[PDB]
Amino acid sequence: RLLKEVKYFLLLRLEVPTTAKDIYTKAETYRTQIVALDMIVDNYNHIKTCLLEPLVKKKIQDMEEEVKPGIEEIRWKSTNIDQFISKSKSIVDQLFETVNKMKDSLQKIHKSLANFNVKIIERKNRPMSPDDYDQFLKAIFSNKLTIVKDNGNQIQKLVKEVLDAVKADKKQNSWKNYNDYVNVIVIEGISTAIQTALLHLNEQINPVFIKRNDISPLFDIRLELGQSGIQFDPEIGE
Amino acid sequence: YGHSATFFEGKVYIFGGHGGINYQRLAFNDLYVLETENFEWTRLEPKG
Secondary structure: OHHHHHHHHHHHHHOOOOHHHHHHHHHHHHHHHHHHHHHHHHHHHHHOOOOOOOOOOOHHHHHHHHHHHOOOOOOOOOOOHHHHHHHHHHHHHHHHHHHHHHHHHHHHHHHHHHHHHHHHOOOOOOOOHHHHHHHHHHHHHHHHHHHHHHHHHHHHHHHHHHHHHHHHOOOOHHHHHHHHHHHHHHHHHHHHHHHHHHHHHHHHHHHHHHOOOOOOOOOOOEEEOOOOOOOOOOOOOO | OOOOOOOOOOEEEEOOOOOOOOOOOOOOOEEEEEEEOOOOEEEEEOOO
């Protein structure tokens, strides 16, 4: 408010403050330096809360341990912000990059996991037969199974791009910890992806749903007369 | 989970698998002994 107050006094001329000129000349330099400063400040915040970190403490710490002075340093008496800023910026980028590169891989995995599950089985209007549904669905199973592998191949490639990102050793206990964490998401995702289609069978197969809707049969049964017993293609048994 | 526990005179032995620390999932090569008198957990590694 002082910085704005000085400018309006010069506009009306009348009188001016004593030794507030020095604050008003540099004023412009503060308004570049505050924005410039901000730049980094933000990034730090959204850097602190991005973690879940017990993997890659040292880096983050090093940024804390790097920042831990400055703040101490900070005195508007003498601003050498230009540098500081930039040294941070060369290291906040690099870090900010590794964070995102990793995050980006996880989101892409989740997206890949959703995309492959679709609808395990599809039903074609009117009935056909047991072997004819086996013949029909073989073509769809082969296409659906490959789409999972292709998605699985991407996910596997995206894990390597986290190592190239973070630049941490496979031997170190941290990256192992995470390497297990990623597989569990793929496990859970596979669990859901497998469940969703098993539920899609449960709706078509359970008698209380198919009755309430006007949904047709789905399998065929042939019945041949036998002397020793009643013969069906499906036998109506295990 | 899905492991095994054999009891002997004054000592319980567990060899079983499907488990791990944190998120990791695998089967166990290792046999963990405990002495029921105190309930002390000692991992025992065979020479074989």
